[PDB]
Symmetry: C2
Subunit: 315 residues, 2 copies
């Protein structure tokens, strides 16, 4: 729509665009003040899905959730500045590998479980967990995306039987489907005819390949209980015996990224730059309006974590 280049003007204040990385257009970009790379979602206003995703992401902050840095609304456009995830979809990685070893699966699955536990702890349900919605960042860490359908009906193969007719329990079902696909490279319930796939899900029966360990088979049946009330709880999952093989500590699901605690180095650089003192800056930062100040703080925090200088660009 439109084709206007003036629509980009306020954005170009803060970011330097680079090439499209996704065709809801997604461009790679550099945040000018920090030099950090980000992915920018460009929407031309021609959904309540976006408003749902945006509002969820304002309240969620976690090492396995793809981070919202900046929301820029223009007369004609909505811009979402998001964490940049060069590693691609978990889905791509699954196809490319045929199927994952139990050790490989466990590494990634502990991360999916980290993210989803945190989501539930903030009173949300994703309702659309599937490998297309999981991305690898530069460090090969998984990032949960796509909060359009979240609550305070995804894709069918991943949808719990309870959910189809008529919350956190369905996410556990979906993670169950995820775990099987990771270790098998194909779905537990699948068919060309969508009507047939529906009945399979409802019976709840599925093939179990020779290469799955008994441990895996047990976890799978605990997550894929067609009775929602029989599904394993998030609590028991966090330290489940399969989950802890090779690790010996439960999944650390608690967020490492606070809304309350500010980092002093970053506040310092922001104060100096905007010509303020700390209390003024800290108050402004803690309003989290997800304006340009939000982005610069989080990208500076992200810059520090990388071991780069805590420095904003001289302008």
């Amino acid at each position: 729509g439109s084709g206007s280049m003036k629509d980009y003007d306020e954005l170009l204040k803060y970011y330097e665009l680079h090439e499209t990385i996704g065709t809801a257009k997604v461009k790679l970009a550099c945040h000018i003040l920090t030099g950090e790379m980000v992915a920018i979602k460009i929407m031309d206003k021609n959904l309540p899905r976006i408003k749902t995703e945006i509002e969820a992401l304002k309240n969620l902050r976690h090492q396995h959730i793809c981070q919202l840095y900046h929301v820029l609304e223009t007369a004609n456009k909505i811009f979402m500045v998001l964490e940049y995830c060069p590693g691609g979809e978990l889905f791509d990685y699954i196809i490319s590998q045929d199927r994952l070893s139990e050790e490989e699966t466990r590494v990634v699955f502990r991360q999916i479980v980290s993210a989803v536990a945190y989501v539930h702890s903030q009173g949300y349900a994703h309702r659309d967990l599937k490998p297309e919605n999981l991305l690898f960042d530069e460090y090969h860490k998984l990032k949960l995306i796509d909060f359009g359908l979240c609550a305070k009906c995804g894709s069918l193969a991943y949808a719990a039987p309870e959910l189809i007719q008529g919350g956190s329990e369905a996410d556990v079902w979906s993670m169950g489907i995820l775990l099987y696909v990771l270790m098998c490279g194909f779905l537990p319930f699948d068919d060309d005819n969508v009507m047939a796939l529906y009945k399979k899900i409802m019976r709840g029966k599925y093939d179990v390949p020779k290469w799955l360990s008994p441990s895996s088979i047990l976890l799978l049946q605990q997550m894929l209980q067609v009775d929602p009330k029989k599904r394993i709880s998030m609590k028991n999952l966090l330290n489940h015996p399969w989950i802890m093989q090779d690790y010996n500590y439960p999944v650390e699901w608690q967020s490492k990224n606070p809304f309350i605690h500010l980092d002093d180095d970053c506040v310092t650089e922001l104060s100096v730059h905007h010509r303020n003192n700390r209390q003024t800056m800290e108050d402004l930062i803690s309003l989290w309006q997800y304006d340009h100040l939000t982005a610069t703080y989080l990208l500076l925090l992200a810059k520090k974590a990388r071991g780069k200088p805590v420095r904003l660009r001289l302008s």
Copy 2:
């Protein structure tokens, strides 16, 4: 439907790689080893697609992104396409701020080639804009997105900044010439001739037809822009006069060669020979099957073998 059975027939001929773009995954064609882009459509999730497909089956040209292979399954449509690593013309303009007149002409002669050929096959693209132009590895332009293209002279039934004033009221190939005018201006200025925050204002600027002329524009450039950006369609320069127009031929001294260098009728003997060896046929039999152009794996394999040869690499299948 998140079903993976959908990929079964595809993974026979192609090995998928990461999404680069209705999703787009990069892929390798197994027999040839050539890189391709596979556009993935979920059927439960437009007739725009059927339109692009029937157009691309009939259009074949060095500046049109080539359709190699169409694969349809119960839930999905696959489209195998020429791979364009160089990106959108739009992004390259932004990265350069604006193009010199010489650079513009280099790029613009290719756009003219593509669109002239399109019109010559009885079509109008109807959505020319720099997002729909891609660079390949040789930094050559490839025209894409035939979702909106139509037969002007045919049976009945884009983005605003690029739309001719006539399209705003309620016709022909002449609206493409207008879009090519917008394109040329953007190439040389780095901003639109008609643009505004308010869309109603934008309709009106376009229909009035008046626009800024920056000082860095040459009289020649101004002259051509004036010929393409006629709000009255009958006054607009014709494709014929564009092809050999003086600005167009500055530095070249030959008109734009728009005629296709990629044939439906002439088959390449090496490629056919290699395909004969592989499918256990003789020449006349093999050639008969290739000429049916079904855009099955055979069409894909012939065209990618033809491309492998053009690249000057060995004509060899795995």
